[PDB]
Amino acid sequence: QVQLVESGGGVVQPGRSLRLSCAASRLTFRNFGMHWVRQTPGKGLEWVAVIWHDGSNKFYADSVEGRFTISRDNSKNTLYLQMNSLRDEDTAIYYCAKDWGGASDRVFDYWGRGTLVIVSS
Amino acid sequence: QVQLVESGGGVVQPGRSLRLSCAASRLTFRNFGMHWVRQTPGKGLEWVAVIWHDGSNKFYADSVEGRFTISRDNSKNTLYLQMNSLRDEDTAIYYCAKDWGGASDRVFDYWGRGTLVIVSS
Amino acid sequence: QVQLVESGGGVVQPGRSLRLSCAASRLTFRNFGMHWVRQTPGKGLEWVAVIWHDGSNKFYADSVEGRFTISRDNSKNTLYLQMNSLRDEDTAIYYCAKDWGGASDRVFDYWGRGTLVIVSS
Amino acid sequence: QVQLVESGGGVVQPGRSLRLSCAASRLTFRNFGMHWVRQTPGKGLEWVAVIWHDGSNKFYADSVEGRFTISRDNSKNTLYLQMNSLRDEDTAIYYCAKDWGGASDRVFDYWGRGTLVIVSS
Amino acid sequence: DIQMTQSPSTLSASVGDRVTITCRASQSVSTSLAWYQQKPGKAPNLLIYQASTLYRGVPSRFSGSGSGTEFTLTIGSLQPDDFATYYCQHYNSYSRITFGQGTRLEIK
Amino acid sequence: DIQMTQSPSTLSASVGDRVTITCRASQSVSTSLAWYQQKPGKAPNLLIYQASTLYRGVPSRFSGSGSGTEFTLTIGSLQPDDFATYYCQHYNSYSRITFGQGTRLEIK
Amino acid sequence: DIQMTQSPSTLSASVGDRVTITCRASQSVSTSLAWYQQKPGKAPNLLIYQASTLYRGVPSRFSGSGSGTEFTLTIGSLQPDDFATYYCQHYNSYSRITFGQGTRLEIK
Amino acid sequence: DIQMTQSPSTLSASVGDRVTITCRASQSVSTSLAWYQQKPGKAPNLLIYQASTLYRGVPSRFSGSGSGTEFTLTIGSLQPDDFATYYCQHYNSYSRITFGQGTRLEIK
C-alpha cells in the first residue's frame, strides 16, 4: 500500500553527527525522488532536502546547506540523510516524503511516520 | 496475426488478492514492452502499469501505486499483473496492450479481448 | 560548513595575466551561481562578474569587459577567473561570493576569505 | 566472392502462406546476422526482418509483425522467411541482405539477386 | 526562501458551517500551491495541488481557489472528522519549498 | 497527471457529413497525443499517433491536427462504419498516460 | 518509425557537373545514415555509411556530409555510369530502419 | 550603472544607543537592496535583503526600511559587537551590482 519507515533517531549533543534512514516498503523506489521534511515543535513545517531518482542532483534549504548530506541507495530500497554539526535549531521531528510525480508539482503524498532527533545537553 | 488472450478474472472480496495473465501468441514478446489498460463501467480508460522489455523498470499510475505488481515471463511468453488490497474502485474490465515500438510514442496498437474483474460482496 | 578558499594571488606587473581559483568545500557547487566581489584598499566594493550554474551565461562589470574572463568547472568543485591586460586600478583584495539562490534576490551569503593581488613594478 | 541466391517465389492468393529461402555461398554465414529487404513496385524500399547470428533475437517491421517468421539454419548456410496471412500490400520483390559487421552500423553490403512474390487472385 | 502567511492562525467553527482559509505569499507564486491537513500525532495529508485541483481520494467538500498572492481553501460542509491543522505550501519555480505556520480548526 | 478534457461529449451526425472532435489538455503536451476508436463490444483501436500521423491500415478519411493544448480529430466524410466512441490519449514526457472521457457519435 | 523524405525527387544533370542530394529525417538520427545507389534491374549498392565515411571500393568522387536531421550526398564530377536511383537509410538505435523515396538522376 | 550613495560616512555612538544609517540611490531601484556589515579583517556579511527582510541568523535588533531611492537601517539597541563598517548594495534588474562607500560606526 506503500509505507515509509524512518529510523535512526535519538538524542545528540551539539556538534556531533547522526544518520537517518527511510527504508521504504512496496514503493517503486528507483522511479521516485524523495524528500525530507522537518516539523519544529513550534508546529511549523520546514523543508530540508530532495534527491533525484538516481541521485544526479540534490537541493538543500539554506538552513542545512553544507551541514546535511542526503544520499539514496536504490538497491537496498532506502534513503539516507547524514547530519553534521547540529545545533539547537535542528531539534524537531523528521518526516520522510515521496514526490507525487507530476510534471511540475512538487507535492508529497506518501509521508512516513517520522523519527525524532533532539540536540541538547 | 498477433492476438492477446487474458485470463484470471472473476469476483473477489475487497482486501483479497487476484492474479491476471496476458498469455500472448505469435508476437515477438521479448522485444516489446507491455501495458495494462483499465476500462471502468463509466466507459473511461485508465492506464495501470508498464514493464520494459527485460523487466528492468516498471511504472504505475498513482491510483495503483504499491498495490499492483506486474511481472513478465519472456520464456513462457506471458505477462502477469498481481492484485493486492483491492477495493470498489478497481471493478472494471482489464485490457492488455502492446507498446507500438516507436522511438518516443507510447501508444498501444494490439489490444487484448478484455478480462472482467468484479469487486463486491 | 561551506567555506570558500581563494588562491593564486601575489604581485604582478601591469599588462601581465594572472589566474585565480575559488575552490569550495561542502557546498553543492553545481547548483549555485557564483560571484567575484572586489575590495579596493580604499575600502570600496566593486562587483566583478557572475557565472551561471553551468556557465551558460556570463556577465561582467563595465570596468573589466574584455580583460577578465571567468570559468566554472563543476566537475572539480572549483571556480576560475583569469585577468588579462592587468593594470594599477585592479590593486585590491579579491573576494569570492555565492549567490543566495532566491527567485529575484541577488545577494551574497557565504563569502570567501579573500586572496590579494598587487599590480606594481 | 559472396553470392546470395534466393528462391521460393511465385504467385499466391491472399491468406495463403509462402516460404522463401536465401541459400548463401562462400560466406561465413554462421558469423553474420542477415536481413530481408522488400522493394515495392513503387520503387520504394522497406525493411522487413533481422535475425541475429545464432537466432537469439529477431526484429520485424511493424507492417509484418506477427505474420512473418524468419528462421536461420547455420548448418545448411541458408536463411528462411515464412509469411502467413498474406495480403495485397505484400506484392514486391524480396531481397536478402547481410549486415556489414560494424559495431553499430546496420548497413547492408552484399545484397542478393531478388525473388518476385506476387499476391493476387 | 519565501514567507507564506496564512490567516487566521486559529478559527473555531461548528459542524456543518462554511469555513474559508486564506494563505498569502510574499510575491506572486503563480498557482503552484498545495494544502495539507495534519491531524495531531499523524503526518499531514495532501488535499489540494495546483491550488485548485482535488487530490485523489479526498472528499469533494474541499475546494481551492485564488491565484498570485491571494489563495483560499474552502470547506463546503465541515464534518466532525475535518477538525485538524491546515498548512499551505508552495513550490514555485526557482524558489525553495516553504510552508505556512498552520491554522487550527476548533469545535464550537 | 494531466487530465484530458474532450468536447463535445456527444455529437450526432448522419452518413456523409464532416464532423470535428476536439481534445483539450490542462497543460501543454507538445504534440504527444493519440486517438482511439472503440466500437461497442470490442477493445479500442489505434487511429492517429503523434497527433498528426495516420496509423498503418487506417482509412485516410481521418485527419488529426493541432499542437499544445488544442487538438482536433476530423473525419473528412462520415461513413456507416465510423459510428463509435473516440478517446484522445496523451503520452507526454514525465507525465503518466491518461485518456479522455469519450466522445460518442450517434446516427442522425 | 522515422519517416525519411529526400529532395529533390528527380535531379536532371549532365556529365561532369556537380549534383547534391539532400535527405531530411523527420527527427534527429545523430550520424547513423547510409546512402545506396540502385541501378535499374540491380540490387542497390552501398556508397556511404555513418553519413560521412566512404565504403570500400567506391570511387572517391562521392562525398557525404551533415548531421542531425539534414544530410547531403554530393557527387564531385558526375560520370556516365553514375546515372541511377539513390536511396538514403537510417539505422538509429531504438528505431526501425526505413528507406527514402528515391532520387533519380536523369541525363541532360 | 547606478551610483549608490550612503550617509553619513561616519557616525560615532555608544553602547545601548539607537542609530540609523541611510543610503540613497541615484535612481529608483524598487526594493532590490541588500546590506552588509564588515568587521575589520573579515569579509562583509549579509544582514538585510529586499531592503526590509531579515536574513537567517541575524539578530532581530537590526531593521531596514525604505523604498524607491531612500532607504534606512535601524538598530534598536546598539551592542558592543555591532561595531563595524556597513555597506548598502543593490541588485536592481537591468543594472549592474554596485555598492556604497561604507559607514563606519566608532565607539564614543
Binding site: 534527491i51 542532483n57 | 521479448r30 522485444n31 | - | - | - | - | 538505435s93 | -
Partner: peptide, 27 residues
C-alpha cells in the same frame, strides 16, 4: 539582464520519465 537568477530551480521534476522507450533496441 545580469541580475537574472543564476541557479537550477530546485523544483525541477526529480522522477524518472515513465514514458521513456520501453522496447528493445532493434539495431
Amino acid at each position: 539582464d545580469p541580475n537574472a537568477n543564476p541557479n537550477v530551480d530546485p523544483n525541477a521534476n526529480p522522477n524518472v520519465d515513465p514514458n521513456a522507450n520501453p522496447n528493445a533496441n532493434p539495431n
